[PDB]
Ligand binder design. Sequence first.
Ligand SMILES: O=C(NC1=NCCS1)c1sc2cc(F)ccc2c1Cl
Ligand SMILES: O=C(NC1=NCCS1)c1sc2cc(F)ccc2c1Cl
Lengths: 193, 193
Amino acid sequence: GDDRELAILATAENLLEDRPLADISVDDLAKGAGISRPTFYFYFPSKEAVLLTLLDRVVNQADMALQTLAENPADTDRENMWRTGINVFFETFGSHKAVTRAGQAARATSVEVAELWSTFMQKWIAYTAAVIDAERDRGAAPRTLPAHELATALNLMNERTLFASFAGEQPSVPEARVLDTLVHIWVTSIYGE
Amino acid sequence: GDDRELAILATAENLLEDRPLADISVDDLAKGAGISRPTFYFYFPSKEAVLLTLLDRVVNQADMALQTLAENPADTDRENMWRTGINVFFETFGSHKAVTRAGQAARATSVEVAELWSTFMQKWIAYTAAVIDAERDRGAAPRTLPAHELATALNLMNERTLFASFAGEQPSVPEARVLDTLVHIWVTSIYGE
Ligand SMILES: O=C(NC1=NCCS1)c1sc2cc(F)ccc2c1Cl
Ligand SMILES: O=C(NC1=NCCS1)c1sc2cc(F)ccc2c1Cl
């Protein structure tokens, strides 16, 4: 039941490590999951729906980790607060590089993937802006740019920069340097006058 | 001769304002250019080659404008120096939103488009890093992050943020606010300690 669905998703995630979704057939997913092709269509309408499901799981994993941080503040300085938050995305998406890569590509062809990404980016930007606003209200950060616009640019920077690093794009920040790079830009732009 | 080639390119740029390249046929380009479909194939091997050419023109337009700034420094403060440079990309790509949008999408399917974008991003990042390094050498900027890694993240932020704004993506910075937003992040991250 749910056993076969998880097998399809595990097969898809593993095959995406080796080739794009365009190079994966429904028969590949069924064969790797130990089922027939008609049985596959009971669980998923298409291979694109499998990727949508995988991306939904990764994005909710990141969101739930951020929710955990929000409820459990780490007793540390302000730079470490931002670093621990950026690390949620570095670690979660960096642990699922193949699904991350395929998911971003699917944005151009799937309105469901595009809407899923848009929905969570809006949530993450709104939370970023709320934390910036809290830092301004306590007097720690200066009232410079509108917080929501600053939050938008910083979140888009992280999206583009993390995903370029994971994909080994030319140009990209080395994966071993990208966390420090992003933290620097966040902290200077949020606290700098 | 070159008259017909420019007509094909002008037709393509105008049709891209209304629908994606997938929805444009070679007959559409030929008809709008006043030629037959076989005559089109004399000038271009495919509609994708037309887009590649359009993107090449826009990217070189931006590069040449940046070269002009580099040779003709504006007598103004440091924040205005960075703003005038970011504006090259804001104005050049914002004046060709349809080609910009189609060109970024083609990166996923055209190795020639992907290599073209990669080549110029490497050039722009190297120049950004050289300007940061010059500011550090004269004592105006602190020696914080490696300049090339900082330059990479800032250039990727501008790519993602400008193109989201031009496309009216959800989420995005309003086009009327994006220049100020990016300038703030560049100046604070380059000069902040
Ligand atoms: O990194 C972010 N978003 C995205 N990265 C790549 C895909 S989108 C960050 S860091 C960070 C720190 C915080 F204290 C609060 C929120 C926050 C967020 Cl939201
Ligand atoms: O904006 C840039 N790059 C890209 N924007 C979107 C596509 S890529 C900027 S601003 C800027 C200022 C400078 F003084 C020197 C370089 C420079 C560059 Cl390079």
